[model samples]
Target: RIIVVALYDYEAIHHEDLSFQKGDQMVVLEESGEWWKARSLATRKEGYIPSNYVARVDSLETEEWFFKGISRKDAERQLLAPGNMLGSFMIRDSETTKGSYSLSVRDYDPRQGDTVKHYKIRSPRSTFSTLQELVDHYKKGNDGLCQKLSVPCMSSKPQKPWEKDAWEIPRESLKLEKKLGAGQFGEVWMATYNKHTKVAVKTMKPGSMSVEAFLAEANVMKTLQHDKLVKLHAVVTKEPIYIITEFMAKGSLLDFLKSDEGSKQPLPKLIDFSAQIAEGMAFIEQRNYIHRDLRAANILVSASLVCKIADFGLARVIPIKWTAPEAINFGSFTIKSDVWSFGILLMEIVTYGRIPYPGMSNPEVIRALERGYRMPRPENCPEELYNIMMRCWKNRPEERPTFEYIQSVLDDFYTATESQYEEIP
Candidate 1:
């Protein structure tokens, strides 16, 4: 069989023992750049060889080779050896390969070559066997081989039409003036209502579950009345869902941290931001609402430095039906859960938008924390702030501080700061 080898390094020449020759049949053991580490049919020894070093045994005749399966010892003992022509089998194109071959095992010899390249029997195109198992095996063995070979075995299928059709936002709508950003669901646009009133419109794809989730979020926001929380404006559901919310011109707390002003100044403002978040969270807890997905992405900041809790896509309203006895369950939403999210947000703000547990997926973070893993505090984070975060991330949900208590503590800190400011004023 013919295989192409692309070179990334010149180490192939130094390893001459791996060289191949013209008319030599080779089985691909692995691939690295312009070099294929293969086993020669003549010698049965592995070598780093170039594609130009070998050719197909026959231009018209096809070959069927199998790398994995029954041992060569057993086949040799059965007198199945090389130089015996196996019946022809038809090859089919499964993924990257244009075609595959199927043949009987009796006609081929196992001891003649290092790897088998000839089959004993051949089956016509009418009855070709599926090679999905073999394809999966190769994919697992080499991390980049599938990609390098442009094989369809590991390629992600295109998004379904329903998912593609769900994202329909009127970019020109007066309500959507500025594009905040786009996510997996759809685009979030900054808009204005009544000309002077700024709001955020989050539009979701038609089939995206984000629309349903955000709808629930809107209902929760409408019910919440808190000074530190962002307000819900209205929801539009013409085709795809559009969630309208009060626009915090200063963007998110993460955005603030990235600004030049934040970098040069002392971070007392950040503490103030944290205080506001706690206040908002306290109100949600009082209402028995839980913001499951809390991070820098969910906290918004106004030009006045007022921080508001926003984005409730992952928020859940607890139901009395799902509760169990002996459990102090807070319906579908739990205060402790919100606190955990708050801890993550706190880390993000302190690290100037760095995610807590960088490079970790949501599941990874949850698994680590479930096993008593504590997220590391960022550099330069105040000791007091760090302690607060740790308290929220306690392993036992009930062991965590109540949002009401958190609010009181932060409120006292804010009040003390204001008193000091009054003296200066």
Candidate 2:
């Protein structure tokens, strides 16, 4: 049985649903859709709880020192950061070898000053069976290396958005003004919170989503804070609930890219935009959450042209053209599937909001995918960048590149382009 720790409290409403408090430990018996059947360790009561509300304790994902999908460059960069010292280390996935791992450690050399070193953790050789076992072995003494592993590298965790009693805002404090638009979930409006702050209010239509599910989703969203992610400010859990977020003046990226001025944006700016989105996606991927609906339409642009991912938390009705083959056929909605959608988003970026597979119907796209066909490189798209997009579309999900790697690639390209143009004047 898999053990999980609750990230939030859930009180049982339906007879079968489980009630849990934040930080409660439970054994997951079965997982299906959004809910998981689990037995609380505190009371030994068995019932159902939302899957997203708990994090599996058995996986390496819960390990602070285990940095999955990070590149060697990033590992070195993180290890060399100001707070890190000699013997600070982290275990990361090998960038060059599939299914292999590497240990990156910070050490000092007489001539070289401070440097980051990487050592391959051999899989074939009869070493420790588990990563934790291997770490334990290395901690005792470095059997082979520059220095003994002294400390696991540290990184700050994102703080919960609000303190106790701060999340539930008084409905009277919000002043809903102009109607912005309506979506699959509900109507959105430009509103003022506390009479000064400009905020976007998303009103959930009655019965569209259960109140418990909505609050659970909001709780998760509130915890995720990043520059490229739409910030969840507060929620009004009462009838006609509101999901208030920081307002993006420029609106949806799809409309922005389709506009005349946006269409005229140079390739470098487009690459920058994509890199920003990839950065947010990498953060989400690192947290082990999948943004089920990732597309240009779901991305919002700020007044300063910054892009932030929006409209997440609920779920989606598989956008076949933008979905991975496995997800479309088998109902799998993992981070890998989100990578497939990111590839489509890249296509939208390069073409300035052109519809993916313009002439082909959704059914045709599905058939084409079955035959190993993929979208062709858009005109003027860089060959290397297009190659990255193709990698994201790999039929085998395991073969696809991680969002972290993708972000690095885009970041490298964007920086190079910026510096290249800097010399033009």
Candidate 3:
């Protein structure tokens, strides 16, 4: 049995259908394909409900107030909506804190009028036992909150369509909808699983050494689970193997930054993107896996604008500018080499998809590196961030900072900025 929360309000059209309002917690008794039999935790009633209407209780998307990976400006805009009350509040995945959440609440400022205030809700070390407890405590009294959380923001965000948490997805349930893009050996297709859930499926033709390597990549991906990492759902190991993963609508970060809209993202947002990539990299490093290709193109952005590392463990063409010196000269790829590429990727982000070492060819970049010539800081790039990038480019592999250290630095920087309430343009 599994606990789940309704994502949308459901009115029973049939007597057997379970009726529930959004955020109603229920214990799933049985999952029968697209539908499930569940007992409502709130009303103590058992009936059938569409599986896609509810998400696992542990998933952040199920929480009524939690806006996973939402931006600060978006949170403020939502809480300030006319329908919301003075103390209506919501929790958002903290842009600055990586793994932490931020509580944004509409409050009355005597001189400033209605305003939204944000509070960092650090996890595990948080004052209250659970997020529920934290909200309850705040509702009782302001204490440290700008004002008590009086009501929920009651968001209508399109919660992730529910899918059973399983590593092996049935092949018969998957329908290839359309081709999204293609690599040298495989093609990615936008597909539907169980006629409901959208997923990206990478299909390889002609099983051989290439297919063996693809299977290895799928194996590595299946073992990893992190918000900042593209989720691997399953692999169809039969002829023309299919690698199924979460579909990221926003596409690759490289293409996103190359677009007019993504190019104009504010500095704070860019920094948060870096922090997210670092966090994902840290997870990969801890698991003893090296993302041989770590670049803007390999990183995918979700519809929510959350950055996640994708295309892991794939044998792909190497971009000379992104490869570390040791990796090029000695044919070595370690976590440190990934760090070097991350430095290049940071330049890509800072420059809004500008080619690394502008005004130079791959040979020129190699020559410059040999002479200890690093790319100068991009125009308007933060000095501190540049310093971090420079440290990542340290010649000796062991001298570079670890992804864990980089994540901490970026997280600390964002947290400090949030505490100061500094505005970034």
Candidate 4:
């Protein structure tokens, strides 16, 4: 959710007005440390305001419904108490892990009692990279929750949606192969399952994450069976926690783009791969799941080079080039953040995985974005593709179109262009 700020001072960056006294309301347009760009509600004008002099509009529970009776200056000082955009989600007084925050949430069980679940995630700087990953990890351990999400062919017992627990696979069922690469939470490896099928395995470190947290998100992912999504198969929550999924023969899109094989991929293959990534993201969107990370690194390629989304991690503490402004500045993650990332992904696809803003540092990117700077259209990036990317980059989170819109546009474009898979050597 985009949180707007209320102003307290009478300062205007460009205009002179003595009448613009205390109590004038200005909406925060952008944040820059101590100073912020705010638009006046009275004159419909924009200017700079002090960060301390402004406060977030309180939610209904503490709704500042009417400001008529009080002076704006008085309200400003009251906001001296700090707004909701105050601190990170760290537990008060509880002993914390060396590089993580302690979060304890509970699930209600009428049959038993309140079951408390403890979770800790690696904290790079301070801010969290993703809430969904942590939540999913928590849900992954809810063993029976997977069956509730999947087709009920497992047993004669009737399955219900609102049930607890999730699906769990036996640890012995999997046989480890060679390490494929690195994963957000652990290592990505190739493994054999039940003897015949080879699969990709992502394992968490011995004490990296909570078992309940990882397993909690495991079942939620298990039921996602789209071809575009890297299908999650089974998880071993016992012994050491690990997750198994379908192995991508070609690894990540970013890696593929940098390989000799990828360099040989024809335009048709590129187009098809790009469309497939969007198709997968659309599936997640339609299912109401937000892919907090949507860059090329998170999109994987199969034997035939079809793309599937992967790697949901926890902890992007600082604003990076790929991150959306709202998320970078306010940690407001929504489908809009995905849309913004998708725009960058499109650039990555068309430009062959070149990093956005090659030499710009994190703060430089943050500053550049505030000034309305955007990546130039890549060579051979279809006009329509560029147009869609621009739309996804809309400053207002709500302004970005739904993934369904992207899917429809892609389908129509494919039909019109007669897309084909390029011959690979």
Global lDDT of each model?
A: 0.53, 0.80, 0.80, 0.59
Clashing pairs in 3: none
Give the per-residue lDDT digits (tens) of candidate 3, residues 1-425: 67998888976654566778988999999888657889999889998888877888778777677776677755765676557988899888888788888788887877756767777665333467678888887787777566787888956534342344445556897999999889876799999877757899988766454655666667766667777888787788776777888899988898999887797887867887888899899998898878888899989998868799995756531288999989998889899999999999999998888888889998988999999999898778989999999999999989999999998787556345445332212
Clashing pairs counted in every model? 21, 0, 0, 24
- Candidate 3's displacement at residue 224, Å, is 1.0
For residues 1-425, what per-residue lDDT tens digits would candidate 4 score against the true structure? 33344433343332322124445555667776545666767677665555544456552111222222222212221222222121111121123344333333323346633222233344343343454343343233432221111110011111111111223667686788799887445788899865756888877676545667656666667666676787666678774677777788999899999999988866555766766777777887877777787789888887755678884533221126778999988888877798898888888878888898778888888888999998888668888788998999999989998887876676446343332111111
Q: Say which candidate scores most in TM-score.
A: 3
Candidate 4 Cα errors over 4 Å, as ranges: 1-167, 206-208, 311-319, 414-425
Q: What is the TM-score of each candidate against the true structure?
A: 0.49, 0.60, 0.72, 0.56
Which tens-of-lDDT digit does each residue in 381-413 have in candidate 2?
999889988999999999999999998888667
Candidates 1 and 4 compared by TM-score, better number: 4
Question: Which pairs clash inside model 2?
Answer: none
RMSD of 2: 13.4
In model 2, the runs with Cα more than 4 Å from the true position are: 1-165, 316-318, 414-425
